[PDB]
Amino acid sequence: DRSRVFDILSNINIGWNLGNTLDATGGGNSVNAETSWGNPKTTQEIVDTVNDRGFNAIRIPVTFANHLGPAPEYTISADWLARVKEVVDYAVNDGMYIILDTHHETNYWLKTDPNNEAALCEELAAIWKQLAEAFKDYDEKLMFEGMNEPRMAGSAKEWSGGTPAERKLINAMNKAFIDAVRATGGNNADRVLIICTYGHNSDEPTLKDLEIPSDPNIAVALHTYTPYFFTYVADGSYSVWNGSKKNDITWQYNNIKKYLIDKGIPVVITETGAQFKENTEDIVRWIGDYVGTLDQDGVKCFIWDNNIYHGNGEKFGLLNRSLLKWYNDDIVDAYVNHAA
Ligand SMILES: OC[C@H]1O[C@@H](O[C@H]2[C@@H](OC[C@H]3O[C@@H](O)[C@H](O)[C@@H](O)[C@@H]3O[C@@H]3O[C@H](CO)[C@@H](O)[C@H](O)[C@H]3O)OC[C@@H](O)[C@@H]2O)[C@H](O)[C@@H](O)[C@H]1O
């Protein structure tokens, strides 16, 4: 019986990621990492604006690596932990559902070499023991997502679910994460914990190898920017959405159904979105097809928002954080009103 997790998630309309913020990796061991990729310092007002538009759930990606002390304690710098807590608390103040992750650890220590399992598990657990202790008294609306796209960057199968040995390592790491958090007790005894596949990949072989914990208070996170050629800019990419590629969404979702949803395992899409390609009407249609597909089984998603829209880079921006106005209200309306 995993129905507690389903009940919690059912309270979410749609979610929103505070992207390129606490996950940013500049600035070294400093709170200034937050602004190192060009975003303004997060404020209560920024978070309020997200909530008010209809995104009542927020994912707060955080990269800890450069804020950690030496092994084996990996102590999180006090100033950084305090800042992370301030940002989470903006959301708590507004009664929001929240996901706290670890993020670009994958640029640093989180490289999925199966021969390094012990060091990997131990580092993950050490960070999560500290996070869990810090957030022990926070209510069930705060959820933890152990890893983000864990993988071996630059490997042949980096973006296709890795190798079988890597997927075994992911299973061990998911367990380490759950164990570390549960061992801290308090509200962490039954907090929703959100594990993942290798790379947050949803291909059939990747899902077939995912071990499902016996802990009843878990969910499985995937990232599904599907189809890639619509949502990203690449050789072969396009900006038109007429429905003809809805099958890409359907086929992938039927695997998520086969291995997770139809087995009663909670699933959360912790990142998706489409880069802005002067194609508002197409993105609106894609959201209909994509979010509409998730809604069939009440699966929730969180939209990636990096505050990039007018300038160069990956144009996932939705909230103009400096102005507290939305870059594209038609796109935003399609997300927040998905269930009407
Ligand atoms: O530039 C070459 C460089 O890529 C490095 O990774 C980046 C790269 O995209 C990988 C994508 O490749 C397509 O051919 C894949 O089909 C697609 O599924 C995958 O894109 C990644 O997709 C993820 C979601 O499933 C998403 O969160 C992620 O952002 C997306 O990358 O270009 C996009 C960047 O985001 C990647 O970091 C790779 O490490 C490097 O060695 C080299 O191949």
Ligand SMILES: [Mg+2]
């Ligand atoms: Mg309790």
